[PDB]
Design an enzyme around this catalytic site. Structure first.
Site, PDB file in Angstrom:
ATOM      1  N   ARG A   1     -16.464   0.065  -4.232  1.00 15.04           N
ATOM      2  CA  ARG A   1     -17.395   1.003  -3.616  1.00 15.04           C
ATOM      3  C   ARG A   1     -18.645   0.210  -3.245  1.00 15.04           C
ATOM      4  NH1 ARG A   1     -19.734   3.763  -5.802  1.00 15.04           N
ATOM      5  NH2 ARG A   1     -19.679   5.838  -4.828  1.00 15.04           N
TER       6      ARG A   1
ATOM      7  N   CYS B   1       4.481   0.197  -4.699  1.00 13.45           N
ATOM      8  CA  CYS B   1       3.707   0.405  -5.925  1.00 13.45           C
ATOM      9  C   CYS B   1       4.474   0.374  -7.241  1.00 13.45           C
ATOM     10  CB  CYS B   1       2.939   1.724  -5.857  1.00 13.45           C
ATOM     11  SG  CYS B   1       1.881   1.976  -7.304  1.00 13.45           S
ATOM     12  N   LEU B   2       4.121  -0.572  -8.107  1.00 13.82           N
ATOM     13  CA  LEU B   2       4.749  -0.692  -9.418  1.00 13.82           C
ATOM     14  C   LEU B   2       4.197   0.371 -10.358  1.00 13.82           C
ATOM     15  CD1 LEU B   2       4.620  -4.542 -10.210  1.00 13.82           C
ATOM     16  CD2 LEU B   2       6.711  -3.168  -9.804  1.00 13.82           C
ATOM     17  N   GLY B   3       3.047   0.941 -10.007  1.00 12.62           N
ATOM     18  CA  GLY B   3       2.444   1.953 -10.856  1.00 12.62           C
ATOM     19  C   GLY B   3       2.758   3.374 -10.436  1.00 12.62           C
TER      20      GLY B   3
ATOM     21  N   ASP C   1      -9.288   3.783  -8.293  1.00 13.36           N
ATOM     22  CA  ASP C   1      -9.643   4.545  -7.111  1.00 13.36           C
ATOM     23  C   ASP C   1      -8.535   5.368  -6.479  1.00 13.36           C
ATOM     24  OD1 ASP C   1     -12.296   3.859  -7.335  1.00 13.36           O
ATOM     25  OD2 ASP C   1     -12.464   3.105  -5.277  1.00 13.36           O
ATOM     26  N   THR C   2      -7.310   4.846  -6.448  1.00 12.56           N
ATOM     27  CA  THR C   2      -6.202   5.606  -5.865  1.00 12.56           C
ATOM     28  C   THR C   2      -5.994   6.917  -6.632  1.00 12.56           C
ATOM     29  OG1 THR C   2      -4.671   4.279  -7.210  1.00 12.56           O
ATOM     30  CG2 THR C   2      -4.874   3.679  -4.877  1.00 12.56           C
TER      31      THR C   2
HETATM   32  C1  HEM Z   1      -1.766   7.850  -6.607  1.00 12.88           C
HETATM   33  C2  HEM Z   1      -1.966   6.424  -6.959  1.00 12.88           C
HETATM   34  C3  HEM Z   1      -1.472   5.221  -6.375  1.00 12.88           C
HETATM   35  C4  HEM Z   1      -1.235   4.912  -5.005  1.00 12.88           C
HETATM   36  C5  HEM Z   1      -1.272   5.780  -3.758  1.00 12.88           C
HETATM   37  C6  HEM Z   1      -0.988   3.513  -5.011  1.00 12.88           C
HETATM   38  C7  HEM Z   1      -0.779   2.701  -3.900  1.00 12.88           C
HETATM   39  C8  HEM Z   1      -0.232   1.454  -3.759  1.00 12.88           C
HETATM   40  C9  HEM Z   1       0.184   0.868  -2.553  1.00 12.88           C
HETATM   41  C10 HEM Z   1       0.246   1.575  -1.148  1.00 12.88           C
HETATM   42  C11 HEM Z   1       0.701  -0.372  -2.892  1.00 12.88           C
HETATM   43  C12 HEM Z   1       1.227  -1.493  -1.968  1.00 12.88           C
HETATM   44  C13 HEM Z   1       0.198  -2.245  -1.180  1.00 12.88           C
HETATM   45  C14 HEM Z   1       0.739  -3.352  -0.286  1.00 12.88           C
HETATM   46  O1  HEM Z   1       1.877  -3.325   0.175  1.00 12.88           O
HETATM   47  O2  HEM Z   1      -0.017  -4.265   0.036  1.00 12.88           O
HETATM   48  C15 HEM Z   1       0.532  -0.477  -4.287  1.00 12.88           C
HETATM   49  C16 HEM Z   1       0.749  -1.607  -5.080  1.00 12.88           C
HETATM   50  C17 HEM Z   1       0.540  -1.792  -6.433  1.00 12.88           C
HETATM   51  N1  HEM Z   1       0.171  -0.824  -7.276  1.00 12.88           N
HETATM   52 FE1  HEM Z   1      -0.295   1.136  -6.780  1.00 12.88          FE
HETATM   53  N2  HEM Z   1      -0.836   3.055  -6.248  1.00 12.88           N
HETATM   54  C18 HEM Z   1      -1.281   3.987  -7.062  1.00 12.88           C
HETATM   55  C19 HEM Z   1      -1.487   3.752  -8.415  1.00 12.88           C
HETATM   56  C20 HEM Z   1      -1.191   2.653  -9.219  1.00 12.88           C
HETATM   57  C21 HEM Z   1      -1.346   2.594 -10.593  1.00 12.88           C
HETATM   58  C22 HEM Z   1      -1.396   3.815 -11.567  1.00 12.88           C
HETATM   59  C23 HEM Z   1      -1.172   1.245 -10.953  1.00 12.88           C
HETATM   60  C24 HEM Z   1      -0.891   0.691 -12.174  1.00 12.88           C
HETATM   61  C25 HEM Z   1      -1.761   0.171 -13.164  1.00 12.88           C
HETATM   62  C26 HEM Z   1      -0.884   0.596  -9.726  1.00 12.88           C
HETATM   63  C27 HEM Z   1      -0.574  -0.745  -9.500  1.00 12.88           C
HETATM   64  C28 HEM Z   1       0.094  -1.332  -8.468  1.00 12.88           C
HETATM   65  C29 HEM Z   1       0.601  -2.641  -8.456  1.00 12.88           C
HETATM   66  C30 HEM Z   1       0.668  -3.626  -9.638  1.00 12.88           C
HETATM   67  C31 HEM Z   1       0.895  -2.943  -7.155  1.00 12.88           C
HETATM   68  C32 HEM Z   1       1.266  -4.333  -6.558  1.00 12.88           C
HETATM   69  C33 HEM Z   1       2.816  -4.514  -6.388  1.00 12.88           C
HETATM   70  C34 HEM Z   1       3.282  -5.776  -5.628  1.00 12.88           C
HETATM   71  O3  HEM Z   1       2.438  -6.366  -4.930  1.00 12.88           O
HETATM   72  O4  HEM Z   1       4.284  -6.374  -5.981  1.00 12.88           O
HETATM   73  N3  HEM Z   1      -0.754   1.505  -8.740  1.00 12.88           N
HETATM   74  N4  HEM Z   1       0.018   0.687  -4.789  1.00 12.88           N
HETATM   75  C1  LIG Z   2     -19.612  -6.405   9.236  1.00 12.60           C
HETATM   76  N1  LIG Z   2     -18.386  -6.826   8.524  1.00 12.60           N
HETATM   77  C2  LIG Z   2     -17.709  -7.864   9.325  1.00 12.60           C
HETATM   78  C3  LIG Z   2     -17.989  -6.503   7.185  1.00 12.60           C
HETATM   79  C4  LIG Z   2     -18.306  -7.443   6.167  1.00 12.60           C
HETATM   80  C5  LIG Z   2     -18.325  -7.095   4.802  1.00 12.60           C
HETATM   81  C6  LIG Z   2     -17.981  -5.785   4.422  1.00 12.60           C
HETATM   82  C7  LIG Z   2     -17.588  -4.816   5.381  1.00 12.60           C
HETATM   83  C8  LIG Z   2     -17.074  -3.547   4.981  1.00 12.60           C
HETATM   84  S1  LIG Z   2     -16.970  -3.001   3.305  1.00 12.60           S
HETATM   85  O1  LIG Z   2     -18.302  -2.997   2.738  1.00 12.60           O
HETATM   86  O2  LIG Z   2     -16.448  -1.657   3.228  1.00 12.60           O
HETATM   87  N2  LIG Z   2     -16.033  -4.079   2.474  1.00 12.60           N
HETATM   88  C9  LIG Z   2     -14.583  -3.987   2.738  1.00 12.60           C
HETATM   89  C10 LIG Z   2     -13.918  -4.560   1.493  1.00 12.60           C
HETATM   90  C11 LIG Z   2     -13.661  -3.464   0.460  1.00 12.60           C
HETATM   91  C12 LIG Z   2     -12.385  -3.973  -0.214  1.00 12.60           C
HETATM   92  C13 LIG Z   2     -11.918  -3.008  -1.312  1.00 12.60           C
HETATM   93  C14 LIG Z   2     -11.088  -3.848  -2.292  1.00 12.60           C
HETATM   94  C15 LIG Z   2     -10.085  -2.917  -2.969  1.00 12.60           C
HETATM   95  C16 LIG Z   2      -9.521  -3.601  -4.224  1.00 12.60           C
HETATM   96  N3  LIG Z   2      -8.228  -2.936  -4.529  1.00 12.60           N
HETATM   97  C17 LIG Z   2      -6.960  -3.459  -4.201  1.00 12.60           C
HETATM   98  O3  LIG Z   2      -6.705  -4.552  -4.664  1.00 12.60           O
HETATM   99  C18 LIG Z   2      -5.815  -2.518  -3.828  1.00 12.60           C
HETATM  100  C19 LIG Z   2      -4.462  -3.287  -3.542  1.00 12.60           C
HETATM  101  C20 LIG Z   2      -3.284  -2.286  -3.247  1.00 12.60           C
HETATM  102  C21 LIG Z   2      -3.672  -1.431  -1.987  1.00 12.60           C
HETATM  103  C22 LIG Z   2      -5.015  -0.640  -2.222  1.00 12.60           C
HETATM  104  C23 LIG Z   2      -4.807   0.307  -3.462  1.00 12.60           C
HETATM  105  C24 LIG Z   2      -4.431  -0.517  -4.750  1.00 12.60           C
HETATM  106  C25 LIG Z   2      -3.109  -1.325  -4.474  1.00 12.60           C
HETATM  107  C26 LIG Z   2      -5.604  -1.525  -5.034  1.00 12.60           C
HETATM  108  C27 LIG Z   2      -6.163  -1.668  -2.544  1.00 12.60           C
HETATM  109  C28 LIG Z   2     -16.495  -2.698   5.954  1.00 12.60           C
HETATM  110  C29 LIG Z   2     -16.401  -3.090   7.305  1.00 12.60           C
HETATM  111  C30 LIG Z   2     -16.898  -4.346   7.707  1.00 12.60           C
HETATM  112  C31 LIG Z   2     -17.549  -5.202   6.786  1.00 12.60           C
END
Ligand code: HEM
Ligand SMILES: CN(C)c1cccc2c(S(=O)(=O)NCCCCCCCCNC(=O)[C@]34C[C@H]5C[C@H](C[C@H](C5)C3)C4)cccc12
Length: 404
Positions: A176, A347-349, A241-242
């Protein structure tokens, strides 16, 4: 608005801002859905946020997530600088390498662990709900959605509940952003917390998720401290956050749909199905990939280095996948979506997530069956990699509730 690359044809240009969609006030899902109106190509290019492609239909989205060879996770986020600095495992890794890290990560958050967690999940939800019930009101997002997932993770990773506020402060400033820190800086601070814990767990390992990850074997050899750290970073923020935002979208809907609440109140066994339909309707994730080489995809010429947004959120909202997608029907027959992703990174979670969702919905309706959005409250949504709800003011008559 970034300069239009020569290889991108003018007629595919649609300047959608994934961080500030044009009609956000009308709902974030509604804001993205504009990318699905009849006069919008299946694949467009937006000059916003550095410039990148956007697959707008479930078919292309699913296909790209399947073709990891052309669409790499090396740089999965927009803007490019965030995606380039992001090094979590296995989300920034492509198979075949990603295969075993995913398998190790699965040991600590996969189906196995879930059944053993039920009682703690059940207990936490009730405890949180019981503390609010008699108050007659709350900011659901703040009072329940936020503290629910972190607490679950702490028990999972075997961390002290005392560290919750500190960890929350760390993850919060990363996911955030307020503009004070670059993504990289936020990441380092988070890592600064994990580094020592992993060092400790590697010398004296317990049975917590962190001890398991840090002492695991991957691709025929011991996982490095650096890799363990990069995996724990994700295992931490992945379920925050998800879950927080999804739960919020769900509760906002149920607060506005007495008819739907009663449906689940009278037919509790339908909650699991209601969860799946809500997961579709209020899908909220949107990350992507980077082209590993020039490639023609569905008639469109993509160049090596191009970033492509593949909105997990959009598949299920696609009319072509679900009839009248914006309508919530707990009785929908073939609920298709990619809310949890698709392909090798699915998603593994997901199983843990569904339990957190179903338990929350079950335990809440059981104690507080009748509630509404605070009168005069205008719910604000936020858009990004993980769209969400800023706050959810809820009110209810304590007399209509019951302690269980
Ligand atoms: C409503 C909740 C959730 C949503 C919508 C969500 C969403 C996602 C999505 C869309 C991906 C794949 C991203 C990609 O392809 O780059 C992902 C990956 C992942 N999520 Fe979630 N997720 C949720 C909750 C969780 C929770 C509860 C955990 C577990 C602590 C978690 C852990 C993971 C992990 C470990 C992966 C990476 C898998 C891989 O890269 O092999 N997720 N999730
Ligand atoms: C001016 N310019 C060039 C800019 C510069 C700097 C900032 C900017 C921003 S910004 O301020 O909004 N920053 C964007 C980066 C926010 C990244 C969030 C990380 C999430 C971590 N979680 C994951 O791993 C996961 C990985 C996977 C998918 C998803 C859910 C789970 C599973 C957790 C995400 C917005 C637009 C432009 C900007």
């Amino acid at each position: 608005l970034a300069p239009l690359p020569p290889h991108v044809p003018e007629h595919l240009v649609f300047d959608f801002d994934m961080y500030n969609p044009s009609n956000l006030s009308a709902g974030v899902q509604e804001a993205w859905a504009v990318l699905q109106e009849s006069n919008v190509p299946d694949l467009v290019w937006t000059r916003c946020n550095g410039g990148h492609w956007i697959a707008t239909r479930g078919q292309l989205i699913r296909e790209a997530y399947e073709d990891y060879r052309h669409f790499s996770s090396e740089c999965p986020f927009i803007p490019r600088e965030a995606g380039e600095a992001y090094d979590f495992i296995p989300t920034s890794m492509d198979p075949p390498e990603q295969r075993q890290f995913r398998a190790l990560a699965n040991q600590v958050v996969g189906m196995p662990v879930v059944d053993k967690l039920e009682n703690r999940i059940q207990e936490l939800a009730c405890s949180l709900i019981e503390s609010l019930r008699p108050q007659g009101q709350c900011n659901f997002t703040e009072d329940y959605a936020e503290p629910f997932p972190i607490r679950i993770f702490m028990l999972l990773a075997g961390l002290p509940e005392e560290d919750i506020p500190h960890l929350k402060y760390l993850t919060d400033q990363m996911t955030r952003p307020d503009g004070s820190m670059t993504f990289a800086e936020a990441k380092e601070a988070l890592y600064d917390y994990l580094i020592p814990i992993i060092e400790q767990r590697r010398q004296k390992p317990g049975t917590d998720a962190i001890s398991i990850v840090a002492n695991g074997q991957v691709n025929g050899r011991p996982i490095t401290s650096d890799e363990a750290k990069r995996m724990c970073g994700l295992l931490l923020v992945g379920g925050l956050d998800t879950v927080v935002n999804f739960l919020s979208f769900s509760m906002e809907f149920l607060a506005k749909s007495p008819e739907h609440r009663q449906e689940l109140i009278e037919r509790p066994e339908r909650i699991p199905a209601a969860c799946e339909e809500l997961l579709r309707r209020f899908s909220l994730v949107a990350d992507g990939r980077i082209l590993t080489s020039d490639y023609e995809f569905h008639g469109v010429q993509l160049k090596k280095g191009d970033q492509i947004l593949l909105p997990q959120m959009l598949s299920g909202l696609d009319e072509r996948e679900n009839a009248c997608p914006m309508h919530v029907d707990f009785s929908r027959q073939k609920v298709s979506h990619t809310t949890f992703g698709h392909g090798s990174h699915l998603c593994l979670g997901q199983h843990l997530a569904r339990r957190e969702i179903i338990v929350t919905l079950k335990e809440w309706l059981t104690r507080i069956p009748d509630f509404s959005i605070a009168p005069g409250a205008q719910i604000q949504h936020k858009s990004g990699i993980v769209s969400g709800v800023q706050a959810l003011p809820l009110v209810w008559d304590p007399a209509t509730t019951k302690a269980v």
